[PDB]
């Protein structure tokens, strides 16, 4: 049958067509090997599946060769944007690949980069944007500083529009990088919030005269050991108090 001289010549004839233009008209290439257009496509489908050649096939029966330099351009474009819509990526496509790609074709490329471990991204829950885990860290920090310095991780999930695990995975990154930021009972808490909390404790101290840690823990819903170390760290710089030890750690005004 066909396959003896076909399989040997097909790949070299394909390459000869790729040298002339990275865009291959599969109907036209099917004339140069004298084959059925559908049989021609199927062998290219198979060659892409085997991992033999890098490219995509549009809805109108053209194949597009993509160089490793052009893949690298696609991966770096998504890195630099951090968050980007599949629609933006299709518009950008001609500047990155010298060919205007369908949204589908762009997805096929991104999924290739993911599998070859040349890019690290995640799908938004609407399926409409790609976001980098570096950009998730950034958008967690922006929404933390925005929402006052204390925010639940579950609220950041809703906001950033990505599955929970992709927020939960960046918590190593936000505590190594930001020495001012800490994880407490499913929330991220900012140096700026603890200073603001210390101010409103000192205002309630200069009114009550005295106040107990167990009363502040019920007031702000924070754990004892954490809240004690956060307030005792701010004693004298922000709180005009004196610590003493009762049944519980207790704070009262010195200048009284
Ligand atoms: Cl991941």
Coordinates of C-alpha atoms and ligand atoms in Angstrom, one line a residue:
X1 CA 0.0 0.0 0.0
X2 CA 0.7 3.8 0.1
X3 CA 2.6 3.7 3.5
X4 CA 6.0 2.4 2.2
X5 CA 7.1 5.4 0.0
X6 CA 4.5 7.7 1.9
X7 CA 5.9 7.5 5.5
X8 CA 9.6 7.9 4.2
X9 CA 8.8 10.9 1.9
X10 CA 6.0 12.6 3.8
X11 CA 8.2 14.1 6.6
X12 CA 10.8 15.4 4.1
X13 CA 8.1 16.8 1.8
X14 CA 6.5 18.4 4.9
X15 CA 9.9 19.9 6.0
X16 CA 10.4 21.3 2.4
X17 CA 7.0 23.0 2.8
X18 CA 7.9 24.3 6.3
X19 CA 11.2 25.8 4.8
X20 CA 9.1 27.8 2.3
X21 CA 6.5 29.0 4.9
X22 CA 5.8 28.1 8.5
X23 CA 2.1 28.0 7.4
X24 CA 1.3 24.8 5.5
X25 CA -1.8 24.5 3.4
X26 CA -2.7 20.8 4.1
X27 CA -5.0 20.6 0.9
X28 CA -1.9 21.9 -1.2
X29 CA 0.6 19.5 0.6
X30 CA -1.9 16.6 -0.1
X31 CA -1.4 17.4 -3.9
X32 CA 2.5 17.1 -3.6
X33 CA 2.2 13.6 -2.0
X34 CA -1.0 12.8 -4.1
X35 CA -3.0 11.8 -0.9
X36 CA -6.5 12.5 0.6
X37 CA -6.5 15.8 2.5
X38 CA -8.1 14.0 5.6
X39 CA -5.3 11.3 5.5
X40 CA -2.7 14.1 5.3
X41 CA -4.2 15.8 8.4
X42 CA -4.5 12.5 10.4
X43 CA -0.7 11.8 10.0
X44 CA 0.1 15.4 11.3
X45 CA -2.4 14.9 14.2
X46 CA -0.4 11.6 15.0
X47 CA 3.0 13.5 14.6
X48 CA 1.9 16.2 17.0
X49 CA 0.6 13.5 19.5
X50 CA 3.9 11.5 19.3
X51 CA 5.7 14.9 20.2
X52 CA 7.6 14.8 16.8
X53 CA 6.9 18.4 15.7
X54 CA 5.7 21.7 17.4
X55 CA 2.7 23.5 15.9
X56 CA -1.1 23.9 15.7
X57 CA -3.9 23.3 13.1
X58 CA -6.5 26.0 12.7
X59 CA -10.3 25.4 11.9
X60 CA -9.6 26.1 8.2
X61 CA -7.0 23.3 7.5
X62 CA -3.7 25.2 7.8
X63 CA -0.9 23.9 10.1
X64 CA 1.4 26.5 11.7
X65 CA 5.0 25.6 12.8
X66 CA 6.2 27.3 16.0
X67 CA 9.9 27.6 16.8
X68 CA 11.3 27.1 20.4
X69 CA 12.2 30.9 20.3
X70 CA 8.5 31.7 19.6
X71 CA 7.2 29.4 22.4
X72 CA 9.7 31.2 24.7
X73 CA 8.3 34.5 23.5
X74 CA 4.7 33.3 24.4
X75 CA 5.8 32.1 27.9
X76 CA 7.6 35.4 28.6
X77 CA 4.6 37.4 27.4
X78 CA 2.4 35.7 29.9
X79 CA 5.1 36.2 32.7
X80 CA 5.4 40.0 31.9
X81 CA 1.6 40.5 31.8
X82 CA 1.2 38.3 35.0
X83 CA -2.5 38.1 34.4
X84 CA -3.9 37.9 30.8
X85 CA -7.1 37.0 29.0
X86 CA -7.1 34.4 26.2
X87 CA -8.6 37.2 24.0
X88 CA -5.5 39.4 24.7
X89 CA -3.2 36.4 23.9
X90 CA -4.9 35.8 20.5
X91 CA -4.5 39.6 19.7
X92 CA -0.8 39.4 20.8
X93 CA -0.3 36.1 18.9
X94 CA 0.9 37.7 15.6
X95 CA 3.6 39.7 17.4
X96 CA 4.8 36.4 19.2
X97 CA 4.4 33.8 16.3
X98 CA 4.2 35.9 13.0
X99 CA 0.6 34.4 12.7
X100 CA -2.8 35.4 14.1
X101 CA -4.0 32.5 16.2
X102 CA -7.5 31.4 17.3
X103 CA -8.2 31.4 21.0
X104 CA -8.3 27.5 20.8
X105 CA -4.8 27.5 19.1
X106 CA -3.4 29.7 21.9
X107 CA -4.8 27.3 24.5
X108 CA -3.1 24.3 22.7
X109 CA 0.2 26.2 22.9
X110 CA -0.1 27.2 26.6
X111 CA -1.0 23.5 27.5
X112 CA 2.1 22.4 25.6
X113 CA 4.3 24.9 27.6
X114 CA 2.7 23.6 30.9
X115 CA 3.3 19.9 30.0
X116 CA 7.0 20.7 28.9
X117 CA 7.4 22.5 32.3
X118 CA 8.6 25.8 30.4
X119 CA 5.7 27.8 32.0
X120 CA 3.8 27.9 35.3
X121 CA 0.1 29.2 35.1
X122 CA -3.5 28.5 36.2
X123 CA -7.0 28.9 34.7
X124 CA -9.3 31.5 36.3
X125 CA -12.7 29.9 37.3
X126 CA -14.5 31.6 34.4
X127 CA -11.8 29.9 32.2
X128 CA -11.2 33.3 30.4
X129 CA -7.8 34.3 31.9
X130 CA -4.4 32.8 32.6
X131 CA -2.6 33.9 35.8
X132 CA 1.0 33.2 37.0
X133 CA 1.6 32.1 40.7
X134 CA 3.9 35.1 40.9
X135 CA 1.0 37.3 39.9
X136 CA -1.4 35.6 42.4
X137 CA 1.1 36.5 45.3
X138 CA 1.1 40.1 44.0
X139 CA -2.8 40.2 43.8
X140 CA -3.0 38.6 47.3
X141 CA -0.7 41.4 48.7
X142 CA -2.6 44.2 46.8
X143 CA -6.0 43.0 48.2
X144 CA -4.4 42.6 51.7
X145 CA -3.1 46.2 51.8
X146 CA -6.4 47.3 50.2
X147 CA -8.7 45.5 52.8
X148 CA -6.9 47.1 55.8
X149 CA -4.1 44.6 56.6
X150 CA -6.3 41.7 57.8
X151 CA -8.2 39.4 55.3
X152 CA -9.4 35.7 55.2
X153 CA -7.7 33.5 52.6
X154 CA -11.2 32.4 51.4
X155 CA -12.1 36.1 50.6
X156 CA -8.8 36.3 48.5
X157 CA -10.0 33.1 46.5
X158 CA -13.4 34.9 45.6
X159 CA -11.5 38.1 44.7
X160 CA -8.7 36.7 42.5
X161 CA -11.2 34.3 40.8
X162 CA -9.0 31.2 40.9
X163 CA -9.4 27.8 42.8
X164 CA -8.4 27.9 46.5
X165 CA -5.3 25.6 46.3
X166 CA -3.6 28.2 44.0
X167 CA -3.9 30.8 46.9
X168 CA -3.0 28.3 49.6
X169 CA 0.2 27.4 47.6
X170 CA 1.5 31.0 47.7
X171 CA 1.5 31.4 51.5
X172 CA 5.2 30.1 51.7
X173 CA 6.1 33.0 49.2
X174 CA 4.2 35.9 51.0
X175 CA 5.8 35.1 54.5
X176 CA 9.4 34.5 53.1
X177 CA 9.2 37.8 51.1
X178 CA 7.1 40.1 53.5
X179 CA 8.7 39.9 57.0
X180 CA 6.0 42.4 58.2
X181 CA 3.1 39.8 57.2
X182 CA 2.0 36.7 59.3
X183 CA -0.5 33.8 58.9
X184 CA -3.1 33.5 61.8
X185 CA -6.2 31.2 61.9
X186 CA -6.9 31.3 58.1
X187 CA -6.1 35.0 57.7
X188 CA -3.1 37.1 56.6
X189 CA -2.3 40.0 59.0
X190 CA -0.2 43.1 58.3
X191 CA 2.2 45.2 60.5
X192 CA -0.1 48.2 59.6
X193 CA -3.2 46.5 61.1
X194 CA -1.4 45.5 64.4
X195 CA -0.2 49.2 64.8
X196 CA -3.8 50.4 64.1
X197 CA -5.1 47.8 66.6
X198 CA -2.5 48.9 69.2
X199 CA -3.7 52.6 68.7
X200 CA -7.4 51.6 69.5
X201 CA -6.2 49.4 72.5
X202 CA -4.3 52.4 73.9
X203 CA -7.5 54.6 73.4
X204 CA -9.6 52.0 75.3
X205 CA -6.7 51.7 77.9
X206 CA -6.8 55.5 78.6
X207 CA -10.7 55.0 79.2
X208 CA -10.9 51.7 81.1
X209 CA -7.5 52.4 82.9
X210 CA -6.9 48.6 82.9
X211 CA -7.7 45.7 80.4
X212 CA -7.0 41.9 80.3
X213 CA -5.7 39.8 77.3
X214 CA -8.7 37.4 77.5
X215 CA -10.9 40.5 77.0
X216 CA -8.9 41.7 74.0
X217 CA -9.0 38.1 72.5
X218 CA -12.8 38.0 72.7
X219 CA -12.9 41.7 71.3
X220 CA -10.7 41.1 68.2
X221 CA -11.1 37.3 67.7
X222 CA -7.3 36.5 67.8
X223 CA -5.3 33.8 69.7
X224 CA -3.7 34.7 73.1
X225 CA 0.0 33.9 72.4
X226 CA 0.0 35.8 69.1
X227 CA -2.0 38.9 70.4
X228 CA 0.3 39.1 73.5
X229 CA 3.5 39.1 71.4
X230 CA 2.0 41.7 69.0
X231 CA 0.9 44.1 71.8
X232 CA 3.9 43.5 74.1
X233 CA 6.1 44.3 71.0
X234 CA 4.2 47.7 70.7
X235 CA 4.3 48.6 74.5
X236 CA 5.9 52.0 75.1
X237 CA 6.1 52.9 71.4
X238 CA 2.3 52.9 70.9
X239 CA 0.7 51.7 74.1
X240 CA 1.2 53.8 77.3
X241 CA 0.9 50.8 79.6
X242 CA 2.5 48.5 82.2
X243 CA 2.2 44.7 82.0
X244 CA 1.6 42.4 85.0
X245 CA 0.7 38.8 85.5
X246 CA -2.6 37.7 87.3
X247 CA -4.7 34.6 86.5
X248 CA -4.0 36.0 82.9
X249 CA -1.5 38.5 81.3
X250 CA -3.0 42.0 82.1
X251 CA -2.2 45.6 81.0
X252 CA -2.8 49.0 82.8
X253 CA -1.9 52.7 82.3
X254 CA 1.5 53.8 83.9
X255 CA 1.0 57.6 83.5
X256 CA -2.4 57.6 85.5
Ligands
LIG1 CL1 0.1 24.8 40.9

